[PDB]
Structure 1
């Protein structure tokens, strides 16, 4: 499906693509917001007449968006959620149009056995709901989050790039009765400035801050109590894509020492697609930032990557806005938000 049908009806797709390609848009939240806006635009302006055809068109659009940018998971996720929202309503409608038993909320045997309305408003409302959900995640985490950290315990923080994780930390630090020491890993080629900023923020907040280089993780590990990840995207089996540099090794270390590994992200970051390949989804950074000169640097081929992938075996906890979950359970949450056919587009 090409962009021959959408030219004067919807123009913003091109702009979105541009934003994606040259990285004019920054932060997954912003991307999600943009996607939502696009969806709204599609809904308010275009014509349908039929429902299945419309659904197909939407699917095609989603596919196109995916093809334009693979590292933008939030965009995909939101679309999927919207589709799911549509789908249930459609199913409900069909039952009235025609004019059923189930043990649970969803059935497996229903796939094997042979099975005009104001749905537009409902669809519109769905988008609004999604927006609302996106707006506040930290408020639904803090009631569970400020129960884990105790007095005279030491925290270790890889990936300070995420905006949620910092907030979570701050909320914990607010409490007068609670006291903890913070060890911060830098992350050289991608996270350094961000890490520094985080450290500064911590200092401002009036907490004991310890800036640790990437090599000095091993010596302090006898005192480490907990591990927190600043992840960017959540998946099916448990595996997560983290917000750039210095996460994997630390996680491995934690696993070795049997240190508890926590993860805070959200359900809008959660994807119903499987991360079958690390090489396909993980994007690599820039060689220019590491070392100067060009003519001797033709011989010196430098390897540097943005995003990081951590196996589900190391991570045990996934606290979101709903509540505390596991990597062995999060799949069901995704299913509760994205339907069966909506996985493949």
Structure 2
């Protein structure tokens, strides 16, 4: 039915125009619901046609907004699910020393069942990540964060009921989103503090631990985080302080820092330099990058829903999550 088409067009337009779901969990849920819907009301018989249809639609959605990789992750996850279910019904160096044109009957029902299982796991990821707060936080500890992330907020406020610590929050210069996080934390009695990015290194001598949130995790264990996290990681590495990253599994993309320049999302310079300056706006060149790149060497641990792990094992999670043929999409 054309209702699926109307929904797909609305989703692509809302992603390309402005931001859609505010939380990453809602974004992943909306993407998975749209994928399940595309699978449910559509004419497909064999796995190759369904996979190509999903690939074209996912390619469109990714071209709509390349920095929104949570949707590419969900598309690749659905593709991997389809491949696994098809291999279950149809039948490296160690390995080294395939058509999808057979049409079954119960393939759609089990694909939908797998998608629902993935949805429930997506829902439980938040508590699964927040449950590991006491294993890394201690009493009379100092924690530093940047920006506003729901995962880090839960991780911090889940341990305040049994531990007492001091939280330092560094705002983001273009979009001062750390103020909301600081207010939400102070509402729970955590003794929070707000500060600028210019005083990151100046205050990072009394800090004991750092917990932050990322937008996506690259293949070699590096991140695409908000602007200012590269400097935070540099200061942590200079003072040899562990930097924890609380990110669910859907924030993991199967790509290495191949690309160039289109990594960061550039928005209007109105936030950096207002339009009411004068005539100097014709000469002055202003750039406003929203995100930045954080190498893996400056990261210490990754707290996920399946337990903490080191960055040197993220490649295995990639091999476990996505299929090598669906990396380009």
Q: TM-score, normalised by structure 1?
A: 0.87
Aligned residue in 2 for 1:226: 209
C-alpha displacement at 1:7, in angstroms?
A: 5.5
Gapped regions of structure 1 (runs ≥ 5): 1-5, 96-106
Aligned in 2, Cα 1:205/1:9: closer, same or farther, shift over 3 Å? closer
Q: How does 1:37-56 map to 2 (within 5 A)?
A: 37-56=33-52
Gapped regions of structure 2 (runs ≥ 5): none
Aligned in 2, Cα 1:279/1:135: closer, same or farther, shift over 3 Å? same
Q: Deviations over 1:92-141 (max 9, x none)?
A: 2222xxxxxxxxxxx6555x589923111111012212221221223212
Which of 130, 133, 138 is 2:118 aligned to? 130
Q: Aligned with 1:207: secondary structure?
A: coil
Matched positions, count = 322
Aligned residue in 2 for 1:209: 192
Which of 200, 213, 220 is 1:237 aligned to? 220
Q: Aligned with 1:222: secondary structure?
A: coil
Q: 2:32 & 2:182 partners in 1: Cα distance?
A: 33
Aligned residue in 1 for 2:248: 266
Q: 1:114 & 1:250 partners in 2: Cα distance?
A: 47
2:108 is equivalent to residue 158 of structure 1: no
Alpha carbons 1:138, 1:321 under 8 Å: kept: yes
Q: Aligned with 2:144: secondary structure?
A: strand
Q: Aligned with 1:323: secondary structure?
A: coil
Which of 54, 71, 77 is 1:58 aligned to? 54
Larger radius of gyration: 1
Q: TM-score, normalised by structure 2?
A: 0.91
Q: Aligned with 1:227: secondary structure?
A: strand
Q: 1:267 & 1:114 partners in 2: Cα distance?
A: 28
**Alignment root-mean-square deviation, CA:** 2.1
2:3 is equivalent to residue 19 of structure 1: no
Aligned residue in 1 for 2:321: 337
Aligned residue in 2 for 1:187: 172
Q: Deviations over 1:141-162 (max 9, x none)?
A: 2333321111222111122x21
C-alpha displacement at 1:209, in angstroms?
A: 1.8
